[PDB]
C-alpha cells in the first residue's frame, strides 16, 4: 500500500486574495505550531510506506498536514481563513480517528491542538 498524491496546494485558475486572517495563519499560527517539540509527525503527509501503515489511506480519505497547509497559505490557495482552519482541524481529527485514545501520537496531537486553539483565539477581525 502506496502513498497517494499529496493534497493540491496550488491552482493557477483559482482566484487569490490576501486577508489579515490568512496572513496571521501563516505568520503566527503555522509558525508557532511548526516549532513545537511535537510537530515533527505533522510536518509532512503521512508516509504510509515508511511508517508501514498499509491501511492508513483506506481509512483516512481527507489527509492533511502542516507541510501542505504551509504551501496552501504561501500559494494563496485559500479564499477564506475558515478553509485553512478546517485543514488544521482535519489534521488533528485524522490522527484521533486512525489511532487509539491515549496513544503517544494522540497526546502529541492534543497538545498541538491546544496551542492551535490558543492562537486562533487571537485571530484579527477582517480588515
Query: Are 21 and 124 in contact, with CB atoms under 8 Å apart?
Result: yes
Residues 6+ apart with CB under 8 A from 1: 48, 49, 53, 54, 55, 56, 57, 58
Q: Considering the domain boundaries, does residue 1 fall inside one?
A: no
**Residue 7, in any domain of the structure:** no
For residue 49, the enclosing domain spans 19-123
Do residues 12 and 120 touch, judged by C-beta distance below 8 A?
Answer: no
Is the CB of residue 89 less than 8 Å from the CB of residue 29?
A: no
- Of 47, 85, 91, the C-alpha closest to 65 is 91
Ramachandran assignment for 52, one of left (phi > 0), alpha (psi -120 to 50 degrees), beta (any other): left
In a domain, 10, yes or no: no
Q: How was this structure determined?
A: X-ray
Q: Resolution of the experimental model in angstroms, please?
A: 1.9
Report yes or no: 91 and 47 within 8 Å, Cβ to Cβ.
no
**Residue 95 located in a structural domain:** yes
With CA atoms as reference, report the closest residue to 4 among 43, 42, 60, 52. 60
Give the side-chain half-sphere CA count within 13 A for 38: 14
Measured in whole angstroms, how far is the alpha carbon of residue 67 from the centre of its chain?
7
Amino acid at each position: 500500500s502506496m502513498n497517494p498524491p499529496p493534497p493540491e496546494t496550488s491552482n493557477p485558475n483559482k482566484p487569490k486574495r490576501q486577508t489579515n486572517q490568512l496572513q496571521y495563519l501563516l505568520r503566527v499560527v503555522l509558525k508557532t505550531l511548526w516549532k513545537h517539540q511535537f510537530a515533527w509527525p505533522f510536518q509532512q503527509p503521512v508516509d504510509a510506506v515508511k511508517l508501514n501503515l498499509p491501511d492508513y489511506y483506506k481509512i483516512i480519505k481527507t489527509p492533511m498536514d502542516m507541510g501542505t497547509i504551509k504551501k496552501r497559505l504561501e500559494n494563496n490557495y485559500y479564499w477564506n481563513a475558515q478553509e485553512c482552519i478546517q485543514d488544521f482541524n482535519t489534521m488533528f481529527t485524522n490522527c484521533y480517528i486512525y489511532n487509539k485514545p491515549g496513544d503517544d501520537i494522540v497526546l502529541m496531537a492534543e497538545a498541538l491542538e491546544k496551542l492551535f486553539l490558543q492562537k486562533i483565539n487571537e485571530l484579527p477581525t477582517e480588515e
